[PDB]
Symmetry: D2
């Protein structure tokens, strides 16, 4: 199904304000993406709070499931949420007690998605891999999409690659809510994810981010 | 140390936050007795009223200075003044609801000043929080310990619900004094009891009360 | 003619498996139920010496030994002479997870305990497999009813060498054998457990626990 | 590093003893599988404790990652652990407080894998979907494989489909340990899973189980 006001190529405008371990920051983002191919890119710039005293990687998943390749046999809740848009809320529970919450209100004007992003993280240990900037990248992940109390819900077993090829686990819970009433909820399905920083300066004040996402029903069909 | 904390202190508090996309602003003015571990506060919602969620989830964000510390336990919080301290908190409810909170506590004369932030996400629409089915926080015991050079408190909390059911919440708080060299305490326990004394129908005005006592657990209590 | 006596004996036998290592431990002790105090002499019969820290087993070695005030229902003393049983999960912060069961019966002045203990996923470099634990810190068990079953959740912490701590979350469900035992309201149970003495390999251990129920501040 | 001694067609012999909510049970298993194709089937029969008073589905993932299709660019820790074999330990954390632990000692003799399985579950609510037997199936899952404390570890975001098209979440952590020294540890990778009860009698005293598993590196390389 389609009926989408979404174009094969869309612009992305993003502004994130947040606070991690008492450090405030504001980050602007501008990029493009192909929603029906599940890919998007963005140029990020730290406007306030730079250089960040924590690992930039923890913010990257907050920098839109519209950019996910959905097959025909799986309801695309996110592309059906427009032109009105949708919003999501997220909790990030790291294995060393660090906990983050995030929210994003996504709207659309013409060919541009607008993202109002907030990010708050607490209880990160001073000598943990986040505050010591020992993270290398997010590993590829698979988000489990299901309905809980009438709201589409995604749980992810995530892992940050660390120096020395160790890993730093993080459990993600996201709730997605369309702004329009009556948007049909999808059945249980999986969404493969891979997010990557293509380039960045030394202090991570400027970052180029990329993500590729594909929805599927899992084995043994797809 | 020459006692910068007085037996009777005033409390000024200002909380800004967002729970389930709903922004709110709450002002607070109250008094307390730090050496007796008791405090009261009059809360008034300035923005976002009436709140569409249970007011009880905010109450523990509305200062461990107001905790009776015995002589045999280091009082990290009373030693953090006049400069003050700050804490960060995470609240993990059993139905997926997760809250984070911060508070920057300063002191000017006989008044504590509190800059509080509160953010909650993923609360189910039919859960006891969004349906406002909570009655009170049950009495709790905070477990104080040092982790990575930071005093940490873990609490097994439970909200009493309508229908005499309970609603579990796990709390972890990290306390950090602003002055360098403040002596960290050993392992100890802090009993807590928080209670809404009165409120209007929409909880736009709330009178809150807390009593806290630190101890070493059995059999030293 | 109460089934609970002021001074009662305790007979216990634990069989278990931690990280693939099987063990059998016998226990014999005494206790004062109304004072909430008990002691026990433990002896490893199989699997000795234990390759893991003995402290993780100690809470598996009976809430009858808890001083209950009048204003709090004593579910555990009401469960006898027939007895009760509990199941327990121990979730340690480094991924180690333990489950435990205990079927408690009574004959005369003696409680009988059929205890099982199973643990998995303890890291080889963790404080349990390195035996770096010193003691359990004093804890407070949160008692409440969930789906008609009395449940206790505890924020526990093991003191380690170097004055560090090692966190463990405990949930216990208590079920009386007899139907119609009155369920208590919400209350707290302070705990303090201690190994009084032990030989070098912990093949013989003297264990002690004191427990007191209360309603928290400001009523207790 | 060495020859796996694994054949394209293997027999499977399994014996599980366990205890869930105070109920003891013994279940025997006999089936076949194709290790290089990542597929296996098994006929289960309850020898003791029948009929089971709990949902049979909670036991099915305890009924061997040898039966997983591994590409050449990913180290196959499990096929390389034979002929000597390996063992795994697992914890199952359900969202309503029910917690299970499980272990399996896997050896090999000729064309037959031997499995010594143990399973213990506690704190399942009496009115929960497990004790009321309201589960339908495991949804397709993706196991995240990584090295933790020198041990290959798999974390999975699992979900049981319930009657009423609701879902019942479960977090799984498995540690895999080869019996032989010198087995090369793999890098981070994903293992898609799909497990299904093909047939069963009314009391689940006899159950036909099937699993298909494929290892991969995630998007966009796999």
């Amino acid at each position: 199904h389609h009926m989408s006001a979404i174009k094969p190529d869309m612009k992305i405008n993003l502004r994130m304000e947040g606070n991690v371990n008492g450090h405030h920051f504001v980050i602007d983002g501008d990029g493009t993406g192909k929603p029906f191919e599940g890919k998007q890119s963005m140029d990020l710039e730290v406007k306030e709070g730079g250089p960040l005293p924590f690992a930039f990687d923890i913010l990257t998943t907050a920098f839109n499931r519209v950019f996910a390749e959905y097959p025909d046999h799986i309801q695309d809740y996110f592309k059906q949420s427009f032109p009105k848009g949708y919003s999501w809320e997220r909790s990030l529970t790291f294995e060393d007690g660090g906990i983050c919450i995030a929210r994003n209100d996504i709207t659309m004007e013409g060919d541009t998605f607008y993202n109002k992003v907030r990010f708050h993280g607490v209880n990160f240990p001073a000598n943990g891999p986040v505050m010591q900037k020992k993270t290398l990248k997010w590993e590829p992940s698979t988000e489990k999409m299901y309905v809980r109390d009438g709201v589409l819900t995604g749980d992810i077993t995530m892992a940050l690659l660390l120096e020395g090829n160790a890993h730093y686990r993080c459990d993600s819970r996201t709730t997605y809510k369309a702004k329009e009433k009556g948007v049909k909820l999808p059945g249980y399905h999986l969404v493969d994810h891979c997010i990557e920083i293509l380039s960045h300066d030394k202090d991570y004040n400027k970052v180029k981010l990329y993500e590729h996402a594909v929805a599927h029903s899992g084995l043994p069909d797809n």
